[PDB]
Write an enzyme that holds these catalytic residues in place. Structure first.
Site, mmCIF file in Angstrom:
data_model
loop_
_atom_site.group_PDB
_atom_site.id
_atom_site.type_symbol
_atom_site.label_atom_id
_atom_site.label_comp_id
_atom_site.label_asym_id
_atom_site.label_seq_id
_atom_site.Cartn_x
_atom_site.Cartn_y
_atom_site.Cartn_z
ATOM 1 N N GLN A 82 -7.811 -2.424 9.621
ATOM 2 C CA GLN A 82 -8.978 -1.507 9.304
ATOM 3 C C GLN A 82 -9.932 -1.969 8.274
ATOM 4 O O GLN A 82 -9.591 -2.238 7.223
ATOM 5 C CB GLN A 82 -8.543 0.014 9.011
ATOM 6 C CG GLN A 82 -7.839 0.648 10.224
ATOM 7 C CD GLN A 82 -7.094 1.835 10.010
ATOM 8 O OE1 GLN A 82 -7.652 2.776 10.444
ATOM 9 N NE2 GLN A 82 -6.142 1.820 9.301
ATOM 10 N N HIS B 14 0.823 -1.049 0.112
ATOM 11 C CA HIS B 14 -0.002 -0.147 -0.132
ATOM 12 C C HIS B 14 0.883 1.221 0.056
ATOM 13 O O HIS B 14 2.044 1.235 0.582
ATOM 14 C CB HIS B 14 -0.869 -0.051 1.154
ATOM 15 C CG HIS B 14 -0.850 0.275 2.417
ATOM 16 N ND1 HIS B 14 -1.050 1.561 3.082
ATOM 17 C CD2 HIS B 14 0.656 -0.197 3.099
ATOM 18 C CE1 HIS B 14 -0.324 1.500 4.275
ATOM 19 N NE2 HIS B 14 0.509 1.010 4.389
ATOM 20 N N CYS C 135 3.547 5.545 5.436
ATOM 21 C CA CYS C 135 3.364 4.430 6.412
ATOM 22 C C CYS C 135 5.007 3.919 6.792
ATOM 23 O O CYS C 135 5.676 3.994 5.552
ATOM 24 C CB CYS C 135 2.436 3.531 5.962
ATOM 25 S SG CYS C 135 2.675 1.636 6.615
ATOM 26 N N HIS D 265 -5.213 5.528 0.930
ATOM 27 C CA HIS D 265 -4.548 4.420 0.735
ATOM 28 C C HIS D 265 -4.812 4.071 -0.930
ATOM 29 O O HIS D 265 -5.962 4.391 -1.488
ATOM 30 C CB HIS D 265 -4.730 3.261 1.443
ATOM 31 C CG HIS D 265 -4.712 3.350 2.716
ATOM 32 N ND1 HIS D 265 -3.893 2.711 3.469
ATOM 33 C CD2 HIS D 265 -5.580 3.889 3.816
ATOM 34 C CE1 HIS D 265 -4.093 2.909 5.062
ATOM 35 N NE2 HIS D 265 -5.311 3.877 5.078
ATOM 36 N N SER E 182 -6.226 6.045 9.077
ATOM 37 C CA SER E 182 -4.954 6.420 9.095
ATOM 38 C C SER E 182 -4.681 7.583 7.929
ATOM 39 O O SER E 182 -3.685 8.300 7.928
ATOM 40 C CB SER E 182 -3.913 5.440 8.611
ATOM 41 O OG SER E 182 -4.229 4.242 9.412
HETATM 42 C C1 LIG Z 1 -4.272 -2.392 10.816
HETATM 43 C C2 LIG Z 1 -3.465 -1.833 10.221
HETATM 44 O O1 LIG Z 1 -2.259 -1.598 10.500
HETATM 45 C C3 LIG Z 1 -3.794 -1.137 8.970
HETATM 46 C C4 LIG Z 1 -5.078 -1.002 8.521
HETATM 47 C C5 LIG Z 1 -5.032 -0.411 7.247
HETATM 48 N N1 LIG Z 1 -3.692 -0.311 7.063
HETATM 49 N N2 LIG Z 1 -2.892 -0.682 8.317
#
Ligand code: A1EFQ
Ligand code: A1EFQ
Ligand code: A1EFQ
Ligand code: A1EFQ
Length: 147
Positions: free
Chosen positions: A115, A43, A97, A141, A138
């Site tokens: 998520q 991602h 990230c 994405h 977050s």
């Molecule tokens: C749970 C987690 O780290 C996450 C969820 C979407 N991207 N990262």
């Protein structure tokens, strides 16, 4: 009819049908090709001022707005789709990230770990497919399913 999430849509500008996936926000002119316990995805995350943690390895304080983050995501999608750049190259350079250091790879996961918007988009992708913008706490994405 079509695989999960996919629907026919009508292009405003061209008058031609296209295909849209409301689970992944993917869109394309071509009819889509053809669920596992696990998928593996990479991602690219663009954070914004309202991210759950508005800080990253790129920027101690992230100040861009959500709208600015979505424009960045839209631009990265365009560069990938035009062939100007590849997904993992942009993730290594620009993802907010910490997985950027691993070309955005998050490894394999089941339902019930990530998520939910991220999970739902990931499980509706087929291997080799990319999402459109995916919105989580977050940030925004783009997702590439690798396995
Ligand atoms: C749970 C987690 O780290 C996450 C969820 C979407 N991207 N990262
Ligand atoms: C709380 C809020 O407005 C928001 C939008 C995206 N993430 N958070
Ligand atoms: C939902 C969201 O984050 C957004 C940003 C611009 N438009 N929508
Ligand atoms: C490798 C890459 O950039 C890509 C985009 C969609 N599927 N693969």
């Amino acid at each position: 009819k079509l695989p999960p999430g996919w629907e026919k849509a009508m292009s405003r500008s061209s008058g031609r049908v296209y295909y849209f996936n409301h689970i992944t926000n993917a869109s394309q002119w071509e009819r889509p090709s053809g669920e596992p316990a696990r998928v593996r995805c990479s991602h690219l995350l663009v954070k914004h001022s309202q991210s759950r943690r508005p800080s990253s390895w790129r920027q101690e304080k992230i100040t861009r707005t959500k709208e600015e983050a979505l424009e960045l995501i839209n631009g990265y999608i365009q560069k990938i789709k035009s062939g100007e750049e590849d997904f993992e190259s942009l993730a290594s350079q620009f993802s907010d990230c910490s997985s950027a250091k691993a070309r955005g790879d998050l490894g394999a996961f089941s339902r019930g770990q990530m998520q939910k918007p991220f999970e739902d988009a990931s499980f509706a992708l087929r291997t080799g497919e990319m999402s459109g913008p995916v919105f989580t706490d977050s940030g925004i994405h783009i997702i590439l399913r690798t396995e």
